[PDB]
Homo-oligomer: A and B are copies of this chain.
Amino acid sequence: QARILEADARILQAYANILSAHAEILRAE
């Protein structure tokens, strides 16, 4: 069951990467 929690953590890390990429794209202009 711990694998589900690790997968959720990885999903949230991917979401954070998405948000950081969008922030950098917005700050580009």
Known: A4-B9, A19-B25. 8 other contacts (CB 8 A): A2-B7, A6-B7, A10-B16, A11-B12, A13-B16, A15-B18, A17-B19, A23-B24
Residues of B with C-beta under 8 A to A9: 3-4, 6-7, 10-11, 13-14
Secondary structure at chain A's binding surface: helix, strand, loop or mixed?
A: helix
Number of copies: 60
Q: Which 8 A-B pairs have the closest CB atoms?
A: A5-B7, A7-B12, A12-B14, A14-B19, A3-B9, A19-B21, A16-B17, A2-B3
Smallest CB–CB gap between A7 and chain B, Å?
3
What residues of chain A have their CB less than 8 Å away from a CB belonging to chain B? 1-29
